């Protein structure tokens, strides 16, 4: 349950994405892969990425993290009401993809750090407050309908 305060924070943040969403996308799939190695392993078409450098050449990686962003942004721009956004999601992330939980948690904490590394003195206490609920909800949401299919 966000305010309307902390979704204008959530939408004025995510103003910074979309002036890049190519290369926001880039990074957080990065940080993602780099800093939790065994993420790689559900990609078939990144698993061959051995070190950030051919990460960072990747057009493909590039596309991948604009469809992810542009996905993400599409359930923020909700503002919580993304039933319909995210049910498809949470189907293909339990179903065919096999998605746990906890990568969710982990790809959160990289928006966050891919937030302040991109724009260092930039992204306030509170702009932060905002948009860590907002991946809270949107993590919660999909873990509601995993617990409908028994998936772990
Ligand atoms: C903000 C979080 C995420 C969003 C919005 C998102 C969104 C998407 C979308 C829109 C697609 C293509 C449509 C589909 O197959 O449903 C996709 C595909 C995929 N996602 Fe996610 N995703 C997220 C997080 C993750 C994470 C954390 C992982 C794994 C660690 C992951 C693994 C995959 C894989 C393996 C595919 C298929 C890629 C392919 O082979 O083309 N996703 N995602």
């Known amino acids: ?12 943040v995510w103003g910074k994405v979309e002036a890049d ?15 939790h190695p065994e993420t790689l392993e559900k990609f078939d078409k990144f698993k061959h990425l051995k070190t950030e450098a051919e990460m960072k050449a990747s057009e493909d990686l590039k ?11 599409g359930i923020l721009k909700k503002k919580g009401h993304h039933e319909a956004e995210l049910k498809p999601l949470a189907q293909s ?14 790809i959160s904490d990289a928006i966050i750090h891919v937030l302040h590394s ?35």
């Open 1 to 12: 349950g966000l305010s309307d305060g902390e979704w204008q924070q959530v939408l004025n």
């Open 21 to 35: 969403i190519a290369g926001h996308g880039q990074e957080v799939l990065i940080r993602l892969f780099t800093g």
């Open 63 to 73: 596309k991948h993290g604009t469809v992810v962003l542009t996905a993400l942004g």
């Open 93 to 106: 992330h339990a179903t065919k993809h096999k998605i746990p939980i906890k990568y969710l948690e982990f």
């Open 118 to 152: 991109k724009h260092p003195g930039d992204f306030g206490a509170d702009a932060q407050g905002a948009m860590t609920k907002a991946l809270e909800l949107f993590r919660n949401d999909i873990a509601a309908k995993y617990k409908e299919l028994g998936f772990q």
